[PDB]
PDB file of C-alpha atoms in Angstrom:
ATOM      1  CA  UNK A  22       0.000   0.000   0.000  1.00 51.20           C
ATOM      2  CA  UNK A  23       1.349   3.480  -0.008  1.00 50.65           C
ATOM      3  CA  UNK A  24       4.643   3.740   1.361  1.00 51.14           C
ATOM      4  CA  UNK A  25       4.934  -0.303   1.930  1.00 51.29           C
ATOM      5  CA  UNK A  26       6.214  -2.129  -0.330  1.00 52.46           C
ATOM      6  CA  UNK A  27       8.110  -5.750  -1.270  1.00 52.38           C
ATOM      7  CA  UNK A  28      11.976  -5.423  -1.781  1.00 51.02           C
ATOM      8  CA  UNK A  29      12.449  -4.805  -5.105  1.00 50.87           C
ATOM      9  CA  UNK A  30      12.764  -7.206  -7.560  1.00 51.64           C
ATOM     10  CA  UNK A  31      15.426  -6.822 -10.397  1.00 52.55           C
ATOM     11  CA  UNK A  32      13.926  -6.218 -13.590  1.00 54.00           C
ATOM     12  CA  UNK A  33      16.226  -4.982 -15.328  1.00 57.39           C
ATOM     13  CA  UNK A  34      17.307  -7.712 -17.215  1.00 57.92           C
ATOM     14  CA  UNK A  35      13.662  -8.664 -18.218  1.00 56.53           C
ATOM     15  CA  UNK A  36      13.391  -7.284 -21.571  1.00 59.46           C
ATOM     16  CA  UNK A  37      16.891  -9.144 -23.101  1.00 57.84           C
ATOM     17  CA  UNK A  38      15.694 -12.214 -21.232  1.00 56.48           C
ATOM     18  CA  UNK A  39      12.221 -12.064 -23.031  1.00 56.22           C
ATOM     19  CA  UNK A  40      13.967 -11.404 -26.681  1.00 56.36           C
ATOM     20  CA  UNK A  41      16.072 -14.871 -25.722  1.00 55.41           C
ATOM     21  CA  UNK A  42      12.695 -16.768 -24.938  1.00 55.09           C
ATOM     22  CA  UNK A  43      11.474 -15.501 -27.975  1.00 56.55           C
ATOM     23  CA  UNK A  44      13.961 -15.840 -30.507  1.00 58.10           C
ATOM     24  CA  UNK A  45      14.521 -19.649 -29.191  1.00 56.45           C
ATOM     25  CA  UNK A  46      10.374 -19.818 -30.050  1.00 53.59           C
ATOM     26  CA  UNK A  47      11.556 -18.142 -33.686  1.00 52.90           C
ATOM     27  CA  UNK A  48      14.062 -20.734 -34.072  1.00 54.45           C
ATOM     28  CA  UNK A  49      11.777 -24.296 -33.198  1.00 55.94           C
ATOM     29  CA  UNK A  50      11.365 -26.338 -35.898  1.00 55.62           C
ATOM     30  CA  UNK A  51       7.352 -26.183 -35.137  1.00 54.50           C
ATOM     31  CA  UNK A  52       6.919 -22.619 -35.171  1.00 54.39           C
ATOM     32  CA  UNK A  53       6.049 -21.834 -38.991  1.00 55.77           C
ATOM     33  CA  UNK A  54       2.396 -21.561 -38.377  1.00 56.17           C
ATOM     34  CA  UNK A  55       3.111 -18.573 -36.192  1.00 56.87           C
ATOM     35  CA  UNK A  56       5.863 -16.573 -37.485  1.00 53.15           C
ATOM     36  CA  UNK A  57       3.960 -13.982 -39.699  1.00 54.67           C
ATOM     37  CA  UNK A  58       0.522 -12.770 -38.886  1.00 54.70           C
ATOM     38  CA  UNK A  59      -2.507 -15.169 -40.605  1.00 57.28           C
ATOM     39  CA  UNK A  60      -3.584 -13.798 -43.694  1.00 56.96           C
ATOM     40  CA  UNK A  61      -7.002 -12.465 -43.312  1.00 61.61           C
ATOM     41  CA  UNK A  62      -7.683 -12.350 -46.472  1.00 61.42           C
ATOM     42  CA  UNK A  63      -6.694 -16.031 -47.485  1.00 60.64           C
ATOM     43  CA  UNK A  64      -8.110 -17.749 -44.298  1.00 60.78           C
ATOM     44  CA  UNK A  65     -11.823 -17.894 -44.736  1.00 58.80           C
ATOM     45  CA  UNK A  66     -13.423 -17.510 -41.232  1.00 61.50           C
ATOM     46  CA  UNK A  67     -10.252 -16.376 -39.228  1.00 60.99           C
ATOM     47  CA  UNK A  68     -11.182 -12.571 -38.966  1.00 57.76           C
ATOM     48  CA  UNK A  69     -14.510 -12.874 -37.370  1.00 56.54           C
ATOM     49  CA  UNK A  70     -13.927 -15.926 -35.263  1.00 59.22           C
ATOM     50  CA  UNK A  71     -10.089 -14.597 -33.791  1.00 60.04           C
ATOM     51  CA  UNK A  72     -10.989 -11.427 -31.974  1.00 62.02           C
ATOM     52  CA  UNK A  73      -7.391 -10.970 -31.184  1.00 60.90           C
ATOM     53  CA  UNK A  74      -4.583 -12.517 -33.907  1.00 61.70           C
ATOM     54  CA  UNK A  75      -1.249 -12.966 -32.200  1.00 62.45           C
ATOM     55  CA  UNK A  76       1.797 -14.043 -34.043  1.00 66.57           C
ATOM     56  CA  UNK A  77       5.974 -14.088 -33.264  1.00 65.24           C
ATOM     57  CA  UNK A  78       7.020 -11.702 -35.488  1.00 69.22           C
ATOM     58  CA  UNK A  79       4.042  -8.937 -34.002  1.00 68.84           C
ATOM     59  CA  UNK A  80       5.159  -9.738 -30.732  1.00 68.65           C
ATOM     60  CA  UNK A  81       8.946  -8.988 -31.349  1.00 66.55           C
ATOM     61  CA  UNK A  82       8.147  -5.868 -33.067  1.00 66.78           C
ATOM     62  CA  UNK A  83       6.033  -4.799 -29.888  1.00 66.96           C
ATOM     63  CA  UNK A  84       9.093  -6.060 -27.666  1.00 69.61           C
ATOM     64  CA  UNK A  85      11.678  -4.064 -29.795  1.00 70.43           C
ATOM     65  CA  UNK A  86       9.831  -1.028 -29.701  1.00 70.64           C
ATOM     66  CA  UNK A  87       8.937  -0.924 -25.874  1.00 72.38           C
ATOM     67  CA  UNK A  88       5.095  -1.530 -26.100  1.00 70.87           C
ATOM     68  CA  UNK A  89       5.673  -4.461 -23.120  1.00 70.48           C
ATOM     69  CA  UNK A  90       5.283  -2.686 -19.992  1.00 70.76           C
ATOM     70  CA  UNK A  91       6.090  -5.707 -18.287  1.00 73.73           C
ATOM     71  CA  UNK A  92       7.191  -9.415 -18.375  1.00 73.35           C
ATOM     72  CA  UNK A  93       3.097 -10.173 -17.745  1.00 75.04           C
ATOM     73  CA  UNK A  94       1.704  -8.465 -20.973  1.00 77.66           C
ATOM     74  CA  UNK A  95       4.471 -10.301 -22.789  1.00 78.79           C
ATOM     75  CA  UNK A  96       3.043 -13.669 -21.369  1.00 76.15           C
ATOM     76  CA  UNK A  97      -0.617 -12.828 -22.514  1.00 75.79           C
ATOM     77  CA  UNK A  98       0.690 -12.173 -25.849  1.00 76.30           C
ATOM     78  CA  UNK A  99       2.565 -15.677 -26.470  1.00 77.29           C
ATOM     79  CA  UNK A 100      -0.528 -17.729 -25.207  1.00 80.21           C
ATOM     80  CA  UNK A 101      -2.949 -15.568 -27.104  1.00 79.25           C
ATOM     81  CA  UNK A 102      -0.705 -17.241 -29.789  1.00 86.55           C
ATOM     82  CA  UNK A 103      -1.514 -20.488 -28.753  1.00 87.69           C
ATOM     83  CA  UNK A 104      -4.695 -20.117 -27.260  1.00 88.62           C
ATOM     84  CA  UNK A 105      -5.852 -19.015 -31.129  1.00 91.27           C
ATOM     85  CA  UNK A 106      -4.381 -21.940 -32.274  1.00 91.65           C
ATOM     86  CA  UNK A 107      -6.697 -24.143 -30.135  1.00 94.40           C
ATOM     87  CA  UNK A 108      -9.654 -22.036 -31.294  1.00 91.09           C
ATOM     88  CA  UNK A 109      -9.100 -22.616 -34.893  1.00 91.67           C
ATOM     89  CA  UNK A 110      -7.232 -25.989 -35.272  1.00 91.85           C
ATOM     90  CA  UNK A 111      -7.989 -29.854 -34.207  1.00 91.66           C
ATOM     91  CA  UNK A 112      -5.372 -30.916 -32.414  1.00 95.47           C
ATOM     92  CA  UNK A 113      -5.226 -33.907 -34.536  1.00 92.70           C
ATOM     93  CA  UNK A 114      -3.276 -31.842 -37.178  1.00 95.37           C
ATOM     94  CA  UNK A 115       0.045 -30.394 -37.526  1.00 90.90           C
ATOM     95  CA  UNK A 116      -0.731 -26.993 -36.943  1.00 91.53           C
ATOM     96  CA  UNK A 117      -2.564 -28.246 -34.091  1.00 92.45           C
ATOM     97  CA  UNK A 118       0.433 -30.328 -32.792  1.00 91.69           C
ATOM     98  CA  UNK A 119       3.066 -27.730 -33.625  1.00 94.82           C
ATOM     99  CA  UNK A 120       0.359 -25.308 -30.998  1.00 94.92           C
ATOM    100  CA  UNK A 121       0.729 -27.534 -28.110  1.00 94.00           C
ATOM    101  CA  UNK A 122       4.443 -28.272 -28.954  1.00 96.66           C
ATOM    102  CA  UNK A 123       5.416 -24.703 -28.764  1.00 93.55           C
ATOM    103  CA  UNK A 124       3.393 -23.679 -25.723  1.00 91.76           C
ATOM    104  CA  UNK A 125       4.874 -26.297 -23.522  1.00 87.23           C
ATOM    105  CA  UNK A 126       8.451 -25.245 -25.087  1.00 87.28           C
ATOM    106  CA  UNK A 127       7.615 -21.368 -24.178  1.00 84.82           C
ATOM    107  CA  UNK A 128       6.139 -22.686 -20.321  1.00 85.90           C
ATOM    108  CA  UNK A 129       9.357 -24.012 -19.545  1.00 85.07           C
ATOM    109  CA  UNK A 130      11.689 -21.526 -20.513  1.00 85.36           C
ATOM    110  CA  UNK A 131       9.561 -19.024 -18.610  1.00 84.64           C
ATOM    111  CA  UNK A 132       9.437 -21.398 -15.476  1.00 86.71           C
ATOM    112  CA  UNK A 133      12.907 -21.793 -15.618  1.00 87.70           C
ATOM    113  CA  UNK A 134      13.965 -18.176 -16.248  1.00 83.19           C
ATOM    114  CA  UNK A 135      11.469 -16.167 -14.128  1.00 83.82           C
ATOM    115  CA  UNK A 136      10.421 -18.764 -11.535  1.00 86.81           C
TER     116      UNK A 136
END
């Protein structure tokens, strides 16, 4: 509350520690079906059912150009990822496969870097 607080946590670091998570996502074999944004205009239905699209290459543009205020937000972003993956894709197919794949990759880098 005002003037009580937790010792302060160390954050400086955060935001070169979230660029390493991400370009090890970049890098996975599995991550082609989110390294560019879905194009709306080729994917019949994914507009009006995916309120909120989510991709790598949005995300590091939004980490390179400070519009994470902190290592939270950046969380939300990478499951919305993976959480619109589910939406739109059985997981009985690759993209489906490559979804889960990648979000238990990204929970244990987190885990092991933050917690």
């Amino acid at each position: 509350s005002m003037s009580v607080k937790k010792p302060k946590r160390d954050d400086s670091k955060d935001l070169a520690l979230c660029s390493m998570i991400l370009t090890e996502m970049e890098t996975h074999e599995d991550a082609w079906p989110f390294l560019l944004p879905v194009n709306l205009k080729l994917v019949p239905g994914y507009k009006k059912v995916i309120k909120k699209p989510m991709d790598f290459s949005t995300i590091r543009e939004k980490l390179s150009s400070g519009q994470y205020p902190n290592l939270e937000t950046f969380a939300l972003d990478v499951r919305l990822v993976f959480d619109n993956c589910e939406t739109f894709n059985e997981d009985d197919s690759d993209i489906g496969r490559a979804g889960h794949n990648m979000r238990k990759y990204f929970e244990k880098k987190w885990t092991d870097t933050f917690k």
